[PDB]
């Protein structure tokens with residue numbers, strides 16, 4: 001029987017691999033079921049068996065596949081010095097991503113880095129790192145966060161394969177996951193409304209679970225679904241007593257800092 | 264029974280090194296089928312140290328955590344310890360406990376994923392698993408590991424059926440062009456052992472979800488925890504009964520998998536590859552220690568770490584020297600940085616990027632070259648294991664001796680790629696053996712005391728250092744504060760020690776030295792290079808930052 005699961009090519013550029021790690025925390029489905037039954041994951045540096053020329057050959061085989069492919073991009077693109085500060089197989093990352101993007105059926109940027117540039121783009125941006133759309137002028141489906149919830153990434157992949165392109169907001173994020181403010185679903189919202197705030201982390205107010213706004217919480221300006229879905233089926237930062245950093249917002253490293261203040 | 268080895272003479276480049284974190288190019292020179300020279304060439308720079316200049320010291324941990332998402336948490340911890348030291352705050356006992364438990368959870372998650380998902384495909388021919396007799400595999404499994412339903416013939420056959428369907432689909436995915444396809448002389452395992460390992464590879468994908476959930480009970484989320492603050496931690500809920508009960512339950516499930524699957528698979532593989540106890544050795548080891556009972560200062564961390572700190576040189580296990588933090592420095596001679604930056608202690612660190620060209624043997628890596636009293640140091644599980652064993656740490660003596668007896672090898676056999684791999688498993692078993700004690704300590708402390716963050720004030724000018732032994736080894740962050748802002752912030756990371764380039768005297772780093780003598784059965788499929796490189800568990804985003 002001639003069979004085909006949709007081909008996915010996953011590139012790693014200027015990244016910390018936290019997005020790959022987030023993806024493999026999926027439980028609906030687990031990552032094994034996804035890659036055995038739903039997609040054909042045809043290049044993925046972190047887990048693939050081939051290395052070196054054999055890995056580069058696997059990439060080229062996938063890019064030239066007659067069925068086409070979807071492109072997942074993890075990491076920003078370091079553009080300084082002709083792209084030479086980020087290279088795979090002796091090629092600038094920007095060159096390979098540009099080539100893969102040009103023929104992709106669709107492009108999904110997993111994480112704030114590929115979506116918007118991320119941590120390496122933070123001032124003064126030594127490597128002149130750029131988001132994928134920023135660098136290439138192509139439209140992307142952005143699944144930001146540092147890292148995004150697997151629910152949002154795997155949910156987006158499954159949506160793209162079975163329904164089409166989900167409705168995106170002005171920052172390219174699927175409204176299914178990014179349509180609401182963190183704050184609007186936060187269990188500390190009744191404290192915020194009553195102006196009941198923790199003034200410091202050691203305070204009795206912090207012990208009582210008062211709102212973290214005075215300690216810098218960016219929940220009120222951050223679009224994500226963290227309190228609704230949780231992470232790892234158990235927790236999220238505010239439940240662990242810590243303010244939201246705003247990590248799914250473009251350029252948050254510069255727009256949401258200092259993290260413990262309301263700048 | 265001789266180790267397979269071709270007559271190949273010539274260069275081999277492997278780029279990308281897959282099944283690591285980050286972007287590494289390895290170049291070797293081979294003569295008559297053995298590596299005679301080696302270069303570890305890290306291929307991405309981000310520049311987090313440069314980005315941090317002028318920022319609020321409170322923000323450092325959030326930036327530096329993004330040095331790496333495989334070893335998530337550990338840089339947030341090192342930065343928090345560093346700023347705590349710079350502001351001269353001693354964190355409350357509960358915060359020491361919580362921070363150290365989150366580290367323990369990280370070791371469990373990280374080492375399980377490493378062995379199965381990064382390293383095992385260098386030793387296990389997955390396609391050969393399709394040829395195994397599942398009843399013979401079940402019988403073997405019952406002889407080498409505790410009874411478990413996942414090791415039944417029915418369970419193993421279901422794995423074989425899934426893999427057969429995948430392989431026959433024509434889309435090999437992550438197995439495309441695998442070095443074992445079509446047979447490879449360097450792969451020794453019986454098909455039955457391939458099948459058991461493959462079944463456990465799939466189970467481990469599910470088990471790592473549980474290990475990350477345990478970590479997130481305390482850490483807020485995984486990846487990239489969010490529960491540390493200057494002066495301690497924020498997670499009051501993590502001190503309480505039901506969360507800690509769930510943390511214990513999940514941790515016990517993970518540890519059951521460590522004891523039932525990881526250790527027996529590791530020992531089974533080790534038994535077939537005993538020749539690899541004579542390949543890939545180095546001589547000097549460094550650890551800052553981890554799991555300290557007193558984290559009030561870097562010196563107290565070094566002194567009180569339950570996985571002890573120390574320095575071993577020249578494979579001499581009869582003497583472990585104290586770590587002198589003033590003796591650490593980094594060279595840039597063979598790195599992509601400006602000339603003039605050799606010999607810098609991290610408080611005087613300079614990060615001035617200067618690229619030349621691919622494969623310039625004068626400047627071939629974005630990593631700096633950390634050195635200690637003029638020597639390269641291997642860091643990580645093998646370093647911790649030798650230091651602890653040499654000092655007679657009782658858990659390490661027990662578990663190391665168990666392995667030495669099972670394999671019929673001396674402690675000296677651990678100076679090798681097989682040894683490095685074994686040590687990672689040994690310490691995972693030891694963390695597991697301590698989880699109930701550490702959880703009880705924190706549960707009892709949290710029940711009687713909810714102090715979790717100490718009071719502190721930002722100094723105008725100060726310096727501080729934060730030490731940790733992360734899953735890959737000795738991690739240090741070093742801050743100079745001036746005008747209440749970051750004036751210098753330097754990371755020196757375990758993969759920097761292990762996989763950096765040559766130092767100022769032209770001396771090979773641990774991975775470069777370890778690669779000398781590697782046999783190559785097939786230069787087109789140089790799995791032996793991967794076995795050694797992967798045994799160091801490289802993280803290039805960590806190493807370069």
Ligand SMILES: *S(=O)(=O)N1CCOCC1
Pocket residue numbers: 220221262
């Ligand atoms: S803050 O600026 O006070 N915050 C209040 C409510 O929503 C966004 C910002």
Ligand code: SF4
Pocket residue numbers: 014015016017018019074075110111112113114118119145146147148329332487
């Ligand atoms: S978005 Fe965050 S977690 Fe993902 S690659 Fe970038 S730094 Fe890492």
Ligand code: SF4
Pocket residue numbers: 182183184186187188189190192210211212213217218219220238243244
């Ligand atoms: S803790 Fe943050 S997200 Fe929650 S109510 Fe307060 S400001 Fe909003």
Ligand code: FCO
Pocket residue numbers: 331334337338733734735736738756757758759801802805806
């Ligand atoms: N473990 C780990 Fe990552 C590396 N090398 C850090 O620190």
Ligand code: F3S
Pocket residue numbers: 145146182222224226236237238243244245246247248
């Ligand atoms: S820091 Fe990020 S993970 Fe959610 S809670 Fe805030 S958007």
Ligand SMILES: [Mg+2]
Pocket residue numbers: 312631753754755756807808
């Ligand atoms: Mg550094």
Ligand code: NI
Pocket residue numbers: 284330331332333334335802804805
């Ligand atoms: Ni890492």
Ligand SMILES: [S]
Pocket residue numbers: 004005006007040065066067068
């Ligand atoms: S395909």
